Design a protein around this ligand. Structure first.
Ligand SMILES: [Mg+2]
Ligand SMILES: [Mg+2]
Length: 70
RNA sequence: GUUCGCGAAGUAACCCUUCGUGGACAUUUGGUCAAUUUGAAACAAUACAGAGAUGAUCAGCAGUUCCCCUGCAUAAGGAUGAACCGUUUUACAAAGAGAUUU
């Protein structure tokens, strides 16, 4: 409700509230992973990520049906 | 062929026959169409695939069409019945700038 009143995402609101009132281990599941910052990648790529971008370009390419391709 | 006569001949006698002869009755069917190849139904078999919006598998309702089929149909089916998916240029003008000619 508060984040709706401020037109800001709620995770930003919670962390900034913690910063106002102030003045993770390994092997845990992070529930807040979608709201958190991304991880940039190692220089070459992983193999599964090469496969992912290949099939992603292949699925973003096609704009036809079965009848039209035939 | 029937019927009403009108004459001759046979027996006649008023009938019954052969024969000629005038009238009456009855009066135009059928084809749009000829009997095996050359004037027009079509499917089915061998071969290939194995159904639209899909990443995959499907329910469908429509629409437009000089395509229709099954159906008693103005119902409903036929893969949502199917074809639909391509090719794409001019009602062409205004202001400014740079070179050629007068
Ligand atoms: Mg249809
Ligand atoms: Mg139908």
């Amino acid at each position: 409700t508060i984040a709706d009143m401020m037109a800001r995402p709620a995770q930003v609101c919670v962390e900034r509230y913690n910063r106002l009132l102030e003045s993770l281990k390994a092997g845990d599941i992070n529930p807040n992973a979608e709201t958190q910052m991304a991880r940039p990648d190692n220089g070459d790529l992983e193999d599964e990520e090469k496969e992912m971008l290949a099939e992603a370009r292949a699925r973003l390419l096609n704009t036809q049906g079965k009848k039209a391709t035939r």
